[PDB]
Design an enzyme around this catalytic site. Structure first.
Site, mmCIF file in Angstrom:
data_model
loop_
_atom_site.group_PDB
_atom_site.id
_atom_site.type_symbol
_atom_site.label_atom_id
_atom_site.label_comp_id
_atom_site.label_asym_id
_atom_site.label_seq_id
_atom_site.Cartn_x
_atom_site.Cartn_y
_atom_site.Cartn_z
ATOM 1 N N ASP A 124 0.786 -1.217 0.000
ATOM 2 C CA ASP A 124 0.000 0.000 0.000
ATOM 3 C C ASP A 124 0.832 1.286 0.000
ATOM 4 O O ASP A 124 1.310 1.719 1.043
ATOM 5 C CB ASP A 124 -0.901 -0.033 1.226
ATOM 6 C CG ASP A 124 -2.034 0.935 1.143
ATOM 7 O OD1 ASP A 124 -2.052 1.767 0.219
ATOM 8 O OD2 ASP A 124 -2.919 0.869 2.015
ATOM 9 N N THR A 125 0.994 1.895 -1.172
ATOM 10 C CA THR A 125 1.740 3.145 -1.277
ATOM 11 C C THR A 125 0.960 4.279 -0.613
ATOM 12 O O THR A 125 1.521 5.320 -0.287
ATOM 13 C CB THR A 125 2.009 3.528 -2.758
ATOM 14 O OG1 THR A 125 0.770 3.622 -3.479
ATOM 15 C CG2 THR A 125 2.894 2.484 -3.423
ATOM 16 N N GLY A 126 -0.336 4.063 -0.405
ATOM 17 C CA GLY A 126 -1.173 5.077 0.206
ATOM 18 C C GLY A 126 -1.127 5.090 1.721
ATOM 19 O O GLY A 126 -1.694 5.981 2.353
#
Length: 198
Positions: A124-126
């Site tokens: 998850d880059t978020g």
């Protein structure tokens, strides 16, 4: 353009004649934007995230420009704390996750080994943090609350925890709490040299 993950991967988007900054979120299936004036017909809908569920309006066939690249797709407008560009649109601009190379046509799940147990987690880059489902972990922890789409959750913080992600080792802070899925955030993705290319 290649993006490292030491800082939130924010980009400029033009949508409905307006300019906004949004987060490239490999951990989101959908694209969710803060309340904004959008022309067209919509459909009420709910989406899940950490902290809970929220009600949003769904607009299909919306045009959106992400870093100059045009794209048409479904857009969800609602009470999100941050504009999020999910996989539905990321795949359209040829977004790839390189750490091997991972396309985003499917949720980017990888296997991790932590505390002698094997689990699957979502890249998850978020997410700034790594949050894992309740599990037996040795050591001393500290209470903490993190926010997500549906609100805030209470998690236990463990520092200096060894994790093997898809082959590579990394040591860092891991949060354990009521998450719908195991999440690997930027504090560990950076440690395994994960970049975002599109």
């Amino acid at each position: 353009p290649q993006v490292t993950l030491w800082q939130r991967p924010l980009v400029t988007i033009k949508i409905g004649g307006q300019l906004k900054e949004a987060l490239l979120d490999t951990g989101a299936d959908d694209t969710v934007l803060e309340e904004m004036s959008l022309p067209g017909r919509w459909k009420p809908k709910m989406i899940g995230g950490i902290g809970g569920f929220i009600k949003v309006r769904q607009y299909d066939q919306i045009l959106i420009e992400i870093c100059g690249h045009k794209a048409i797709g479904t857009v969800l407008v609602g009470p999100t704390p941050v504009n999020i560009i999910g996989r539905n649109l990321l795949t359209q601009i040829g977004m790839t996750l390189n750490f091997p190379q991972v396309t985003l046509w499917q949720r980017p799940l990888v296997t991790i080994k932590i505390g002698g147990q094997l689990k699957e987690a979502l890249l998850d880059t978020g997410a700034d943090d790594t949050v894992l489902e309740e599990m037996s972990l040795p050591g001393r922890w500290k209470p903490k609350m993190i926010g997500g789409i549906g609100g805030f959750i209470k998690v236990r913080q463990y520092d200096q925890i060894l994790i093997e992600i898809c082959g590579h080792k990394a040591i860092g802070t891991v949060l354990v709490g009521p998450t719908p899925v195991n999440i690997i955030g930027r504090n560990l993705l950076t440690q395994i040299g994960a970049t975002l290319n599109f």
